[PDB]
Amino acid sequence: LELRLKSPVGAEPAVYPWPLPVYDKHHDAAHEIIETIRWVCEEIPDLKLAMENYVLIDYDTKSFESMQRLCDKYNRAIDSIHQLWKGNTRPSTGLLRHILQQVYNHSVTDPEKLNNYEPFSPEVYGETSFDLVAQMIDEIKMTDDDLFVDLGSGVGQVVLQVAAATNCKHHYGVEKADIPAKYAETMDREFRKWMKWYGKKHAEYTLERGDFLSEEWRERIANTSVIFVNNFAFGPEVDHQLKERFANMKEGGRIVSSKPFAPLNFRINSRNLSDIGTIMRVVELSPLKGSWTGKPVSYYLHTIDRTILENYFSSLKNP
């Protein structure tokens, strides 16, 4: 016993076993099936016209016959549309939210294994992070000349969201811990498969297991144009090593973080010449000021700017 959903672009069908998988106490693969059908109908007008929409109103998620009828009605409407078309774009924000959740649900089957009790972690990515990352994407406006890196990428959710939305040359995720890095391999596979099923384009990306403080990563950070780092729980020792890596970045290089690497009110003088604040601008970006009705959250945008240090020396030489 199984349920099948035909791809709107002729990719291999999505195949679900029966009884349907349960994700948590209030979420299961039946709600995922209904929402997938609704998303494909909303974005394919001819499909909405062909589909007998009443089947999406009256259904029983606990009945194999009811769920099979619903899947069959959708599969028949897909077939009618493929017949009509007989005779790749980026996903919308709404579809991407659905895809990322679906990818997670098919990949992270045992979330307890993550041993993650933090507020902005993989298990709660959809609550605020998705919206804040979307706001960040609209704010930094990356181009094909950019290289994006997430330092401590978890199961790779930020990398997948950014790669689906932007045209950076490449997106990298580096994760040290065993369990999220192993789950990132499944997230990668499921993301490519589902994006192909929907017929959606994404930029190139790589999720890798590694230590972002290693020698190999020193040159890699130096060549990165956009660093994303949720450093809130890192503490001052790792934060110190990161500032050393950031100090080799190019002019205009950017760092997006959850805790600033330099004070927001940094004032260069003879006693703090050694501080990272001498070579980077720092601003707090808050969607509540940047409408937003979510949590009162912020991120920090750092921009490599060695003219801060240069102006201090020029002012001493020309008082």
Ligand SMILES: CNC(=O)c1cc(C(=O)c2c(Cl)cccc2Cl)c[nH]1
């Ligand atoms: C206690 N942690 C926080 O307040 C916090 C975590 C984060 C993020 O991980 C993040 C960033 Cl850095 C940039 C854009 C989007 C997101 Cl979700 C932001 N603030």
